[PDB]
Design a protein around this ligand. Structure first.
Ligand SMILES: CC(=O)N[C@@H]1[C@@H](O)[C@H](O)[C@@H](CO)O[C@H]1O
Ligand SMILES: CC(=O)N[C@@H]1[C@@H](O)[C@H](O)[C@@H](CO)O[C@H]1O
Ligand SMILES: CC(=O)N[C@@H]1[C@@H](O)[C@H](O)[C@@H](CO)O[C@H]1O
Ligand SMILES: CC(=O)N[C@@H]1[C@@H](O)[C@H](O)[C@@H](CO)O[C@H]1O
Ligand SMILES: CC(=O)N[C@@H]1[C@@H](O)[C@H](O)[C@@H](CO)O[C@H]1O
Ligand SMILES: CC(=O)N[C@@H]1[C@@H](O)[C@H](O)[C@@H](CO)O[C@H]1O
Ligand SMILES: CC(=O)N[C@@H]1[C@@H](O)[C@H](O)[C@@H](CO)O[C@H]1O
Ligand SMILES: C[C@@H]1O[C@@H](O)[C@@H](O)[C@H](O)[C@@H]1O
Lengths: 281, 9, 99, 182
């Protein structure tokens, strides 16, 4: 399992800043906290997937809690943005993007952790492995070298005490809420698979095979050629793995074939393999 | 759930 | 560095004329986060379109999902129009019904 | 014997412009076939048969979807299917804001001197093309030009692209003209 939180803090004005933080569990976006300096009242904490309704019915004050935590984080975030904009300025956008991740085994035990910050798309500082030593920018390829001594000074000045609490959250509550979230996420959901051939061109054609609504996201889509003749330029190719609102995924693939051959599409998702005819004769 | 603490930059 | 968006257009379920469905336009790998995205029906902007909450990948680049419930019919064509500062002009990516 | 495949006005076309792919193989054949490697190009099979017979495949207004590596041949079942022609790389340009081209030590060069040209992009790209105003393949990239000499124009432009969609280039960099010392 993996419980990940993404924070995007945008600085537009000294009075215009936005923070949108999203929680993602096993690839499913389930939580969002949003707030703008302009309003702040209208700050919100929403479940963003159907199973979060079950979470709320079982923990009635979950959303109010998270929102209070969010309101606080934004306060600190407002200071951090103003401070980086002043000290670093920006090249493309004055945005601070940071994230923390929790890796656990099925049964909930902590396997790995990570906390990372990036400003204007540039890595600023990270915390990995033992989660005790922060690293900094990759000054060899980053415009951030323009402010190296300032950044190194900020990184060197991070206590072992502000750090440990980040580590204990990752090893503590983070792995603990992962177990809870685990009890509510949907069960393995296999794809609806569809395939066929199209765009006939002389003795050539295009075979396709697409998988719809599967979760988890890992999947294997293969064309099985029951024959010997294949075009020279032929090479199977899949579009990227894409998300849909309901927390499931989508993936389509294609291959150049001789309209001649027998092809089927094999799709393996978890411990399940489906096979359908795609072109016959 | 979100952590209670943010790093001070 | 600025980063130019990748664009993918797809439906939630296999397309069947007359049957309600969901059209998606997923834009990823971009920076800055500022971006305009529209789903088009036969060349015109669909009004009901919504999008997910801003998020980013491992390289800090952003991504968003724009969507709308729709009913495809034989007569219609759909596409996703995207504009970003890295682009000379808006890009249009048509929906391939089988992908 | 393999047919010939070429493009008019050329293989690198600005987005929106027209371009025609042309195939020729034996003054008698009318059995022309065109195809884009790996991923099929639907526009091809939409070309009127009248035009195909002349080995003419017009694209009135080119888009990103047209870009690709193409090949043609002539033939049928009934008799005859030839070798595929040499591949033609159909490139569309104009998608991304332009990169900048600079002469490494300086734009002014001595005769017989070689020179380093650098193409820089404010947008992250892993591919760069140096074109002479005839192009060479590579976030900035380095190219060496020379030996140089007067009365030979040494004019260049460069493009940036993403190696995953290699036939899709940005707007061209501004024309760079070198000055040969004399
Ligand atoms: C360090 C590591 O494990 N790498 C993979 C990476 O290939 C994948 O893209 C990423 C995002 O889900 O998840 C990780 O597990
Ligand atoms: C949205 C939904 O599916 N609602 C069902 C509801 O029909 C059923 O009454 C309830 C308790 O049995 O469980 C829910 O899952
Ligand atoms: C507990 C469980 O298994 N799932 C229920 C589901 O039946 C119901 O539809 C949903 C809201 O309706 O609340 C979930 O907690
Ligand atoms: C926090 C940590 O240890 N990092 C790993 C990450 O590299 C990997 O990509 C992912 C599995 O998808 O699980 C994360 O927890
Ligand atoms: C490393 C260390 O001793 N910490 C200093 C501290 O004097 C100061 O309070 C903090 C916030 O301004 O900045 C650090 O540089
Ligand atoms: C790591 C830490 O500081 N402990 C907090 C604790 O104050 C709080 O009661 C609990 C919510 O159940 O969440 C934990 O993260
Ligand atoms: C992908 C997945 O679900 N993993 C388990 C795996 O531990 C087990 O070995 C397999 C049966 O062989 O059943 C699966 O459910
Ligand atoms: C179990 C109850 O019914 C479900 O349909 C939902 O409305 C809520 O989860 C509620 O707690």
């Amino acid at each position: 399992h993996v419980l990940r939180y993404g924070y995007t803090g945008i600085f537009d004005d000294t009075s215009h800043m936005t923070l949108t933080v999203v929680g993602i569990f096993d690839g499913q976006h389930f939580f969002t906290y949003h707030v703008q300096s302009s309003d702040k009242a209208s700050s919100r904490a929403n479940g963003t997937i159907s199973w979060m309704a079950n979470v709320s019915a079982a923990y009635p004050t979950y959303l109010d809690g998270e929102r209070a935590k969010g309101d606080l984080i934004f306060n600190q975030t407002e200071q951090n943005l103003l401070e980086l904009e002043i000290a670093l300025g920006y090249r493309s956008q004055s945005v601070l993007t940071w994230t923390h991740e929790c890796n656990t085994t099925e049964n909930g035990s902590f396997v790995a952790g990570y906390e990372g910050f990036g400003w204007d798309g540039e890595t600023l500082m990270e915390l990995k492995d033992n989660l005790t030593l922060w690293t900094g920018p990759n000054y060899e390829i980053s415009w951030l070298k323009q402010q190296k001594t300032y950044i190194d000074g900020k990184i060197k000045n991070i206590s072992e005490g502000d750090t440990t609490i980040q580590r204990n959250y990752l090893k503590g509550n983070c792995t603990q809420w992962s177990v809870i979230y685990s009890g509510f996420q949907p069960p393995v959901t296999h794809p609806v698979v569809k395939g066929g051939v199209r765009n006939q061109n002389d003795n050539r054609a295009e075979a396709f095979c697409t998988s719809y609504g599967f979760f988890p996201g890992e999947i294997q889509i293969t064309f099985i050629h029951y024959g010997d003749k294949v075009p020279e330029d032929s090479e199977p190719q899949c579009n990227p793995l894409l998300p849909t609102l309901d927390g499931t995924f989508h993936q389509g693939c294609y291959v150049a074939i001789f309209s001649n051959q027998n092809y089927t599409c094999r799709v393996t998702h978890g411990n399940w393999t489906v096979e359908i005819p795609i072109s016959v004769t | 759930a979100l952590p209670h603490a943010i790093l001070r930059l | 560095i600025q980063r130019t968006p990748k664009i993918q257009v797809y439906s939630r379920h296999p397309a069947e004329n007359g049957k309600s469905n969901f059209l998606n336009c997923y834009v990823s790998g971009f920076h800055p986060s500022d971006i305009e995205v529209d789903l088009l029906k036969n060349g015109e902007r669909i009004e009901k379109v919504e999008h997910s909450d801003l998020s980013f990948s491992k390289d800090w680049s952003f991504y968003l999902l724009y969507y709308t419930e729709f009913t495809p019919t034989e007569k219609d064509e759909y596409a996703c129009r995207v504009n970003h500062v890295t682009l000379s002009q808006p890009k249009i990516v048509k929906w391939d019904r089988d992908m | 014997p393999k047919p010939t495949l070429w493009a008019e006005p050329g293989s690198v076309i600005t987005q929106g412009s027209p371009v025609t792919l042309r195939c020729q193989g034996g003054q008698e054949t009318q059995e022309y076939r065109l195809y884009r490697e790996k991923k099929t190009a639907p526009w091809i099979t939409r070309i009127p048969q009248e035009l195909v017979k002349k080995g003419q495949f017009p694209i009135p207004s080119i888009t990103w979807e047209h870009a690709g590596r193409y090949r043609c041949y002539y033939g049928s079942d009934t008799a005859g299917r030839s070798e595929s022609s040499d591949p033609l790389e159909l490139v569309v340009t104009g998608a991304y804001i332009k990169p900048t081209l600079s002469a490494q030590p300086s734009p002014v060069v001595n005769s017989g001197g070689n020179v380093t040209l650098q193409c820089d992009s404010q947008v992250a790209f892993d591919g760069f093309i140096l074109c002479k105003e005839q192009c060479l393949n590579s976030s900035r990239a380095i190219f060496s030009v020379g030996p140089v000499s007067p009365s030979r124009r040494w004019w260049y432009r460069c493009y940036a692209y993403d190696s995953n969609s290699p036939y899709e280039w940005s707007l061209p960099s501004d024309l760079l003209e070198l000055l040969v010392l004399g």
